[PDB]
Amino acid sequence: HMRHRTLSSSPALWASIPCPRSELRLDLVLASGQSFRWKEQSPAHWSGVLADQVWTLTQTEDQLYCTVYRSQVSRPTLEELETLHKYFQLDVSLAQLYSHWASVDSHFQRVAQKFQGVRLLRQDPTECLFSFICSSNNNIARITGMVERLCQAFGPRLIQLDDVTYHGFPNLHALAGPEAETHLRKLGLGYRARYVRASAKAILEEQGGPAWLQQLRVAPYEEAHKALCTLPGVGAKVADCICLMALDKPQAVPVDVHVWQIAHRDYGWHPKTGPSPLANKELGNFFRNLWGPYAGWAQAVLFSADLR
Ligand SMILES: O=C(Nc1noc2c1CCCC2)[C@@H]1Cc2ccccc21
Ligand code: NI
């Protein structure tokens, strides 16, 4: 009944945002392990759910083009383009950050030449939290599958485009219920299903629901990180993910065995005393010390560069 818009097909439905490709490369951001809800349904055209609406995004060298599927079919409003502005955190100059990091790190300088426009998305805490609980012992394709199925089974239907049905992220009450783990195991999550249901239940009962996640957004990083590590299936790595990508702590540097490999190979880093909680914490401090208060954003450039 309706298709994904392209820029040639429906140009009166697309608004634009002035935005160079050195501030943003959609293809290095949207499927690079931050959000798992964006898919290149047409060449250079990216579709996904933001906040109970669907968007398609594409860009020139100078412009970022946006169309929104909500209702009388319009182009994006001013309020809706503001939410994309915030989502991409576009008030922060990535050009100036790239330079700032480059001046202390020769290796970064080399990689950055090739991989411009990698930035950090500003995600909803709830979507971010349950996405990263699903990320243990997993890959980007399977996580994308688990998150899609989870939204289909538990969150409200928004719209269909071609043969793709889009659902909003579920609320906590919907993932907390007595049959949720069992349903989630049927959807392929394995053990991760226990953690999803258990963490939803814990945010409601032990922390007072989603206002908690907003409190953590305003709390200091270290306070947020500790509070997150109390949740089932959430340890240091996942907590740093959420901190970096959804709670406005740009200094958070997620460290797993993969980042360890890269630090060692490309920086010559060794713990000053193989991986452990102590050593991984030391490596996050190392990078914070080197790159400064946006160390997690610098990690993202290298992270995407490593996925290639
Ligand atoms: O870990 C992931 N993403 C990230 N972890 O730290 C960072 C990111 C992306 C942004 C900057 C810092 C996801 C989960 C998984 C599994 C296989 C491959 C990628 C990924
Ligand atoms: Ni060595």
Any ligand 1 atom below 6 A from CB of 254: yes
Check: CB of residue 216 under 8 Å from CB of residue 247: yes
Let me know: does 173 contact 204? Beta carbons within 8 Å: yes
Nearest to 305 by CA among 45, 38, 128, 108: 108
Which among 238, 241, 243 is positioned nearest to 219, based on CA atoms? 243
Give the CA distances from residue 291 to residues 21, 92, 138, 175, 278, in Å, rounded to whole numbers and listed in that order.
Answer: 23, 16, 29, 38, 20
Residue 236: DSSP 8-state = H
Helical residues (DSSP H) of the chain, grouped into ranges:
26-29, 78-87, 94-102, 106-114, 125-133, 140-154, 172-175, 180-186, 192-205, 211-218, 221-228, 236-246, 257-267, 277-291, 295-307
Q: Is 209 left (phi over 0), alpha (psi -120 to 50) or beta?
A: left
C-beta 304 within 6 A of ligand 1: no
Taking the C-alpha atoms of residue 294 and residue 267, their distance in angstroms, rounded to an integer, is 18
Q: Whose CA is nearest to atom 20 of ligand 1?
A: 33
Top mutation candidate among 29, 135, 243, 306 for ligand 1, by most atoms within 8 Å of CB: 135
User: Any idea which residue has 């999803």 for tokens?
Assistant: 196
Annotated resolution, angstroms: 2.5
CA distances from 192 to 95, 128, 134 (A): 38, 15, 6
Mutual orientation of helices 295-307 and 94-102 as an angle, nearest 10°? 90
Of all protein residues, whose CA lies closest to atom 3 belonging to ligand 1?
33
Helices (H) and strands (E) in the chain, counts: 15, 7
Residue 65 β-bridge partners: 16, 58
Whole-number Å distance between alpha carbons of 59 and 21: 8
* Of the candidates 94, 79, 194, the residue with the CA atom closest to the CA atom of residue 136: 194
The method recorded for this entry reads: X-ray
Helix or strand or coil: residue 94?
A: helix
Distance 33 CA to ligand 1 centre (A): 4
Nearest to 170 by CA among 182, 160, 184: 184
CA of 251 to the centre of ligand 2 (A): 26
Distance CA 31, CA 42 (A): 14
Q: Which two tokens stand for residue 76?
A: 């994006």
Look up 186 and say whether it is catalytic.
no
